[PDB]
Design an enzyme around this catalytic site. Structure first.
Site, short mmCIF file in Angstrom:
data_model
loop_
_atom_site.label_atom_id
_atom_site.label_comp_id
_atom_site.label_asym_id
_atom_site.label_seq_id
_atom_site.Cartn_x
_atom_site.Cartn_y
_atom_site.Cartn_z
CB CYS A 113 -0.94 0.02 1.21
SG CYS A 113 -1.88 1.57 1.29
NE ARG A 116 2.58 0.68 3.54
CZ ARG A 116 3.70 -0.03 3.61
NH1 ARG A 116 4.01 -0.67 4.73
NH2 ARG A 116 4.52 -0.09 2.57
CD1 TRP A 285 -6.84 9.80 -1.47
CD2 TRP A 285 -7.77 9.85 0.57
NE1 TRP A 285 -5.86 10.15 -0.58
CE2 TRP A 285 -6.40 10.18 0.69
CE3 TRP A 285 -8.55 9.82 1.73
CZ2 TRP A 285 -5.81 10.48 1.91
CZ3 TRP A 285 -7.96 10.12 2.94
CH2 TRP A 285 -6.61 10.45 3.03
CD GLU A 290 -5.72 3.08 -6.37
OE1 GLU A 290 -6.14 1.98 -5.97
OE2 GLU A 290 -5.76 4.13 -5.68
C1 HEM Z 1 -6.27 6.60 1.70
C2 HEM Z 1 -5.76 6.51 0.47
C3 HEM Z 1 -5.16 5.18 -0.06
C4 HEM Z 1 -4.50 5.12 -1.22
C5 HEM Z 1 -4.22 6.31 -2.16
C6 HEM Z 1 -4.08 3.74 -1.41
C7 HEM Z 1 -3.38 3.28 -2.50
C8 HEM Z 1 -3.11 1.96 -2.70
C9 HEM Z 1 -2.59 1.37 -3.91
C10 HEM Z 1 -2.27 2.17 -5.19
C11 HEM Z 1 -2.43 0.06 -3.71
C12 HEM Z 1 -1.89 -0.95 -4.76
C13 HEM Z 1 -2.99 -1.94 -5.18
C14 HEM Z 1 -3.47 -1.64 -6.58
O1 HEM Z 1 -2.94 -0.70 -7.24
O2 HEM Z 1 -4.40 -2.34 -7.05
C15 HEM Z 1 -2.86 -0.24 -2.35
C16 HEM Z 1 -2.86 -1.49 -1.74
C17 HEM Z 1 -3.34 -1.80 -0.49
N1 HEM Z 1 -3.98 -0.92 0.37
FE1 HEM Z 1 -3.92 1.10 0.21
N2 HEM Z 1 -4.51 2.97 -0.34
C18 HEM Z 1 -5.20 3.83 0.52
C19 HEM Z 1 -5.81 3.46 1.71
C20 HEM Z 1 -5.85 2.22 2.31
C21 HEM Z 1 -6.57 1.86 3.53
C22 HEM Z 1 -7.49 2.81 4.35
C23 HEM Z 1 -6.33 0.55 3.76
C24 HEM Z 1 -6.79 -0.37 4.91
C25 HEM Z 1 -7.18 0.12 6.10
C26 HEM Z 1 -5.44 0.08 2.72
C27 HEM Z 1 -4.94 -1.18 2.61
C28 HEM Z 1 -4.29 -1.65 1.50
C29 HEM Z 1 -3.81 -3.00 1.35
C30 HEM Z 1 -3.96 -4.14 2.39
C31 HEM Z 1 -3.25 -3.09 0.15
C32 HEM Z 1 -2.58 -4.36 -0.42
C33 HEM Z 1 -3.48 -5.29 -1.19
C34 HEM Z 1 -2.65 -6.53 -1.47
O3 HEM Z 1 -1.81 -6.96 -0.61
O4 HEM Z 1 -2.83 -7.12 -2.56
N3 HEM Z 1 -5.17 1.11 1.86
N4 HEM Z 1 -3.27 0.94 -1.77
C1 LIG Z 2 -7.73 -12.62 -6.50
C2 LIG Z 2 -6.63 -11.95 -7.29
O1 LIG Z 2 -6.54 -10.57 -6.93
C3 LIG Z 2 -5.64 -9.85 -7.78
C4 LIG Z 2 -4.92 -8.78 -6.98
C5 LIG Z 2 -5.48 -7.43 -7.40
C6 LIG Z 2 -6.21 -6.83 -6.20
C7 LIG Z 2 -6.09 -5.31 -6.21
C8 LIG Z 2 -6.23 -4.73 -4.81
C9 LIG Z 2 -6.49 -5.54 -3.70
C10 LIG Z 2 -6.62 -4.96 -2.44
F1 LIG Z 2 -6.86 -5.72 -1.36
C11 LIG Z 2 -6.49 -3.59 -2.28
F2 LIG Z 2 -6.61 -3.02 -1.06
C12 LIG Z 2 -6.24 -2.80 -3.38
C13 LIG Z 2 -6.07 -1.32 -3.20
C14 LIG Z 2 -7.25 -0.61 -3.82
C15 LIG Z 2 -7.40 0.62 -2.97
C16 LIG Z 2 -7.95 0.54 -1.69
C17 LIG Z 2 -8.10 1.69 -0.94
C18 LIG Z 2 -8.69 1.60 0.45
C19 LIG Z 2 -7.68 2.90 -1.48
C20 LIG Z 2 -7.13 2.93 -2.77
N1 LIG Z 2 -6.71 4.09 -3.33
N2 LIG Z 2 -7.00 1.80 -3.47
C21 LIG Z 2 -6.11 -3.36 -4.64
N3 LIG Z 2 -6.41 -7.66 -8.53
C22 LIG Z 2 -5.99 -6.87 -9.70
C23 LIG Z 2 -6.40 -9.10 -8.87
#
Ligand code: HEM
Ligand SMILES: CCO[C@@H]1C[C@H](CCc2cc(F)c(F)c(CCc3cc(C)cc(N)n3)c2)N(C)C1
Ligand code: HEM
Ligand SMILES: CCO[C@@H]1C[C@H](CCc2cc(F)c(F)c(CCc3cc(C)cc(N)n3)c2)N(C)C1
Ligand SMILES: C[C@H](O)[C@H](O)[C@H]1CNc2nc(N)[nH]c(=O)c2N1
Ligand SMILES: C[C@H](O)[C@H](O)[C@H]1CNc2nc(N)[nH]c(=O)c2N1
Ligand SMILES: [Zn+2]
Lengths: 416, 415
Positions: A113, A116, A285, A290
């Site tokens: 993420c 963070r 947000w 994305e």
């Molecule tokens: C507040 C603005 C936030 C932004 C801009 C943000 C941005 C991102 C981005 C760009 C990713 C990469 C996943 C993707 O691109 O599909 C990500 C992953 C992730 N976010 Fe954040 N996020 C935010 C908030 C949060 C919050 C509030 C949580 C949980 C309380 C969170 C938990 C996670 C987790 C667990 C992942 C990893 C998913 C994985 O392991 O596949 N995020 N976030």
């Molecule tokens: C089953 C296989 O999954 C694969 C993995 C991938 C999953 C992508 C993904 C999984 C998450 F858990 C997650 F948190 C986010 C982040 C999205 C997000 C969340 C918040 C709170 C804010 C923000 N700005 N963006 C993205 N998907 C392409 C296929």
């Protein structure tokens, strides 16, 4: 033993001692690197008393350390209380304060993420008294309203009751609370979001009357206490949406595009002191890419690169004209422009990566490390002109954590 | 244990059995992934005792004779004992020409960070193991450059100088690439030319060179043979193919006065074959467009021309969210490809090359059982997710023969 990471653009070196407190596994070995595996066996998630008290004890030690009460009488009595509660009931309950800390730290520990920096401001909604899907719907509506906040988005998470025997799980069957439907046409084409075709069909089979448009908000499919899931339509006045226009290209609005404002992930598993919260929707947000890069331009998604490039009258014959690259930037410009004009919170990838580097350095100073997954932190466009590209990063798994879990339709035992 | 990689765009799943033949180590453990570290200790390379040398030879000879379908044959066992005998006596051994060519091709085949490996078996190997002096090195390198350049029709090549013996008689090319632009510190603290080469540009001057102090001054060669002080040589300019950079839509782009050399020729790495170390082994192929346009031109710690290009595009450079950097970045990279293509100098765009790499992966999984690959390096530095490699899971492991990093000689040379 200490470890160092270097930023090759600024020569700043940092020292990681936090990895020593790492419990879970990466999936790599001395002889193979799994750094680009989407779902390693260890990032996914049926648990007995044998391994539960050490997981509770470790979480409680962390908790009372953070509040400067390690070894206190409050600390020791809490351990005894949890000890007695497990061996007598084979599980235990978190206090409010422990749940809040746990959910904030699962976000803090999410190495994939980039957002963070904001982890300490998560608004935690305790829905552990929920018992029915109707009750789940009500909590989720209140989450969406609070997080949306008329466009001034606020991070939130709602936590439903933990797993017990794995037969009474709470689950939100949607992957995100708000997502557009996808319909596979007989001619092979797709109307709407191709990523949601399988879920849309389950909804239709469960009784959803589908409008069959290109941007239909899917209904919530909510499972309480291991019962069959139930359908609910989110009130449309709660779903904030942004029509996409471009600041210079007047024809862009005519592409008919829009997106929802609130990214809210609803299919992950929240692990805290060995307890498993299988339904824990969380929201923040968007980073512009994305939507503008992945949602719109992935070949396996809306895939609008063709039509945008067509309208830009680009040389689309050869790839070396970089028409895909040119149109991708324009689409992302429009997403940022639309959201900002409607005063809906959004962050561009330049600002977000810059903030993450500041966050990461601070975490090294005050925590001894910051686990980070370069493959996911680097944005899907313009990678090397962002400062994370040049940043070495150590990936390791800390708990509390968010974990993947199997899609519920593959594991659910239907009641009928 | 027979691992699988999935492509999440196509659902194509490949099964990797090649990693089980991996010998070296990744830098990772089950508790921490170092997949984003630039140079873990394993990727760098002091005597190799008589002990560990013969196992290293046997393993290499075993895969060599397997590749020509003569494993466990007459000639195989004879070669094994021959090398066994020569090691027992001389404490090293010499590769046959055929084994040297096989070794060099496979070091490229095994470079997990290289997107260009679909071409690996077409490498032209120049055996320079009879070289004894820097002037002779200069001769071999001029022939390499002329052969590889081929009047713009670039051809892959490597020139292999004598292997390390006792570590006191080392052949080293002190340049990181055969052709690189100088870099100068300024009185007012800025930088003229290429900042990555500021230290090297000063070493050359602070040892003989007289710099023209222009913005694109081709650096002289600094060649070390048998461990002596290195010597300066100037590559004949008519051997250095350069491309002036102009844009197909923007007439002012020409006015920026940019150019780049056509020949990417890495000269500071170490080639390891069957235990033997080749410390001077310059190799070359042809550029992917983003190497110049994204990294060379737009990296902050390099030429860093984004500002000027966006100004001449009259973009709103007030806020990052106008994506002016991104817009200018694309134009620059269009110009690079257009210039090279117009001048008939080989170049590949990042869409074509990553597509080639997926096909290459398909081919390696089908006929070899896998293909080691480093996602962090394979995914291009721009437009990552609209290229197929972004959605490709890749397994990273270290096979030998290999190219490895080595210390900069001026930090090491018994001067
Ligand atoms: C507040 C603005 C936030 C932004 C801009 C943000 C941005 C991102 C981005 C760009 C990713 C990469 C996943 C993707 O691109 O599909 C990500 C992953 C992730 N976010 Fe954040 N996020 C935010 C908030 C949060 C919050 C509030 C949580 C949980 C309380 C969170 C938990 C996670 C987790 C667990 C992942 C990893 C998913 C994985 O392991 O596949 N995020 N976030
Ligand atoms: C089953 C296989 O999954 C694969 C993995 C991938 C999953 C992508 C993904 C999984 C998450 F858990 C997650 F948190 C986010 C982040 C999205 C997000 C969340 C918040 C709170 C804010 C923000 N700005 N963006 C993205 N998907 C392409 C296929
Ligand atoms: C012919 C066209 C070629 C192309 C398009 C190409 C492209 C690339 C690119 C883009 C990289 C990433 C490194 C960076 O961004 O600076 C790379 C790495 C590398 N290339 Fe290739 N290359 C080519 C030929 C060759 C040849 C002929 C060799 C050797 C015989 C070679 C050996 C390597 C090695 C060893 C690395 C990685 C070094 C490391 O491990 O850090 N390449 N290549
Ligand atoms: C001292 C600091 O080291 C850090 C590490 C990193 C290493 C750079 C690098 C090292 C290599 F070995 C290599 F092969 C290439 C590929 C360049 C290339 C070669 C060929 C033959 C064709 C082609 N198209 N491109 C790049 N560099 C930014 C600084
Ligand atoms: C720290 C990080 O590993 C470093 O910036 C890497 C990332 N990926 C790269 N990829 C390529 N192709 N070339 C590079 O120099 C780098 N640098
Ligand atoms: C195969 C690879 O791991 C997969 O495509 C990853 C690459 N990096 C990513 N990075 C982000 N932020 N989001 C993603 O979905 C992915 N997908
Ligand atoms: Zn790893």
């Amino acid at each position: 033993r200490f470890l160092k990471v270097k930023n090759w653009e600024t020569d700043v070196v940092l020292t990681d001692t936090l990895h020593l407190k790492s419990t879970l596994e990466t999936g790599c070995t001395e002889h193979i690197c799994m750094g680009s595996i989407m779902l390693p066996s260890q990032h996914t998630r049926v648990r007995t008393k044998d391994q539960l008290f050490p997981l509770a004890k470790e979480f409680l030690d962390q908790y009372y350390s953070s509040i400067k009460r390690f070894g206190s009488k409050a600390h020791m009595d809490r351990l005894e209380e949890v000890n007695k509660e497990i061996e007598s009931t084979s599980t235990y309950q978190l206090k409010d304060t422990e749940l809040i800390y746990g959910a904030k730290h699962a976000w803090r520990n999410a190495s994939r993420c980039v957002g963070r920096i904001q982890w300490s401001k998560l608004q935690v909604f305790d829905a552990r008294d929920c018992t029915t899907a109707h009750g789940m719907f009500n909590y989720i509506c209140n989450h969406v309203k609070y997080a949306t906040n008329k466009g001034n988005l606020r991070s939130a998470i709602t936590i439903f009751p933990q797993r017990t025997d794995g037969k009474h799980d709470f689950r939100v069957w949607n992957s995100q609370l708000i997502r557009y439907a996808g319909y596979k046409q007989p001619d092979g084409s797709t109307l709407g979001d191709p990523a949601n075709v399988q879920f849309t069909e389950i909804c239709i089979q469960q009784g959803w009357k589908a409008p069959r448009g290109r941007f239909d908000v899917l209904p919530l499919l909510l499972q309480a206490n291991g019962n069959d899931p139930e359908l609910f339509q989110i009130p449309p006045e709660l779903v904030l949406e942004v029509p996409i226009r471009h600041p210079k290209f007047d024809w862009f609005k005519d592409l008919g595009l829009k997106w929802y404002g609130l990214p809210a992930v609803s299919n992950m598993l929240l692990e805290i002191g060995g307890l498993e919260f299988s339904a824990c929707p969380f929201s923040g947000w968007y980073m512009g890419t994305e939507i503008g890069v992945r949602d719109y331009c992935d070949n396996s998604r809306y895939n609008i690169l063709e039509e945008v490039a067509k309208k830009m009258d680009l040389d689309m014959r050869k790839t070396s004209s970089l028409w895909k690259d040119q149109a991708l930037v324009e689409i992302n410009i429009a997403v940022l422009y639309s959201f900002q004009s409607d005063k809906v919170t959004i962050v561009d990838h330049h600002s977000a990566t810059e903030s993450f580097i500041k966050h990461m350095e601070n975490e090294y100073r005050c925590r001894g490390g910051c686990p980070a997954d370069w493959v996911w932190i680097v944005p899907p466009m313009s990678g090397s002109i962002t400062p994370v590209f040049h940043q070495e990063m150590l990936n390791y798994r800390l708990t509390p954590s968010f974990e993947y879990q199997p899609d519920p339709w593959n594991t659910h035992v239907w009641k009928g």
